[PDB]
């Protein structure tokens, strides 16, 4: 069955775009990792690295 999808329908009948993100593991070791941010490095000083 098809929807109407007219711009005059209420919020209960308006179309919605849904994106689902499913996470998997134990298949491949670390293939999709998040963003690893970094900082500006300095020298000639005792600093943790």
């Amino acid at each position: 069955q098809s929807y109407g999808f007219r711009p005059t329908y209420g919020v209960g009948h308006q179309p919605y775009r849904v994106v689902v993100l499913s996470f998997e593991l134990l298949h491949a070791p670390a293939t999709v990792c998040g963003p690893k941010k970094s900082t500006n490095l300095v020298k000639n000083k005792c600093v943790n690295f």
């Binding site: 298949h27 491949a28 070791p29 670390a30 293939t31």
Partner: protein, 50 residues
């Protein structure tokens, strides 16, 4: 080629021969080329010829 737990290691090296005999003498260490992260078991291999 190596089949470690989660990284198919690949090593390569190129050296001249200039002679026609068995494998030459001298050492030639192969350097790593790519990690190839895969978790697939490998027990058989073949050679691709043209």
């Amino acid at each position: 080629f190596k089949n470690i737990d989660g990284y198919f290691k690949i090593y390569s090296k190129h050296t001249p021969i200039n002679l026609e005999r068995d494998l030459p003498q001298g050492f030639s260490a192969l350097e790593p080329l790519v990690d190839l992260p895969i978790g697939i078991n490998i027990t058989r291999f073949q050679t691709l010829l043209a």
